[PDB]
């Protein structure tokens, strides 16, 4: 059982990647809502967990954490400062070239769970919600990524939409 992300145009099979990290923004009950960050390229460049590929929202082929997920922020109390999320196990996404890329559902849910755990240990014992992007430009509203000099765009909704206690 898997999650099928649309991607326009069709990413070749050879661009199949490993997801290693994320960037998130914190929105303005014990419910804190996070979105895939729609900030400029500066935040991504300065997360330094981005790694190798030129991607938005997700980081591919990048460096993994040592043991557990580690999250970083330049000010947890300033909503305007992004949170860089670094995983320990990568999430393989295999593109078929039919215009969509596949992710394991169980795998992504466990990833989200661990991220939420680390987020709780930062903001407190609240409810971690993940919602889709906030809009802005088509650049950062979608999971963008560069492969072999081509900049593909994928939809992130199915990844960024769950609730955890």
């Amino acid at each position, epitope marked *: 059982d898997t999650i099928t992300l649309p991607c326009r145009p069709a990413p070749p099979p050879h661009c199949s990647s490993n997801i290693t990290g994320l960037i998130l923004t914190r929105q303005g009950a014990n419910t804190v809502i996070f979105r895939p960050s729609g900030g400029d390229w500066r935040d991504i460049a*300065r997360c330094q967990i981005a790694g190798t590929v030129v991607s938005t929202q997700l980081f591919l082929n990048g460096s993994l954490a040592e043991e557990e997920v*580690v999250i*970083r*922020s*330049e*000010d*947890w*109390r*300033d909503n305007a*400062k992004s949170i860089c999320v670094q995983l320990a196990t990568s999430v393989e996404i295999a593109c078929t070239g039919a215009g969509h890329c596949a992710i394991s559902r169980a795998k992504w849910a466990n990833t989200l769970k661990q991220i939420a755990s680390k987020l709780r240990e*930062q*903001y*407190g*014992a609240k409810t971690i919600i993940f919602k889709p992007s906030s809009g802005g430009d088509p650049e950062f509203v979608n999971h963008s990524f560069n492969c072999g000099g081509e900049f593909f765009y994928c939809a992130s909704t199915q990844l960024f939409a769950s609730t955890w206690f």
Partner: antibody
Amino acid sequence: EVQLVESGGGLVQSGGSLRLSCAASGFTFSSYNMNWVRQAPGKGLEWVSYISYSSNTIYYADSVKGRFTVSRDNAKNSLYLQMNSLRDEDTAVYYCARDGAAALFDYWGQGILVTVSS
Amino acid sequence: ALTQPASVSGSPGQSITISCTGTSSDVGDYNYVSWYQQHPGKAPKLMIFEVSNRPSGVSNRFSGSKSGNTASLTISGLQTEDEADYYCSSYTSSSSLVFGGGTKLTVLG
């Protein structure tokens, strides 16, 4: 176990330069943000400065602004506060605090005394 | 910005509450509210964070609450070890960490 041990302090003259040091151990120093606080003998706590993990977000207090300068070195797991043009009003015990996000400050260093007198 | 009572007293076994008052800035903007204990010549120790939460290891006699413009730290079954200074801390409207005026708890013996 989390441990913050501070170095520096002592007598300084009105207008001198002192650099306080804080060594951290027992946690990824490179992950947490940090803070400097100070307390005048027989007065309360006053947040001095804040330094990000990336050292790109630095914040100062209106008083020390222009005269104090925070820094850090992740290679040595160390935080530093440079105090220049010291006034007698800056005589205090300086503490090394770790940012706890919603907890504000969570771990403190033992504290070191700085006495500015001429 | 945060005002506390200078001094509070109570007997062994009794309970006492320490206030921390403000307005639209600190306790009236976000739930970032912490209480630190300080013994003579030692460093502050986090006793309560996020209004009510208690770091593991701290006795369940310490509790915290907030009522808009007034944070409150309650201590039940006073003992000698409680005798110390206490500070509230918060995050201001304009991203500024602010401490309380400090309050001395004396265990009346």
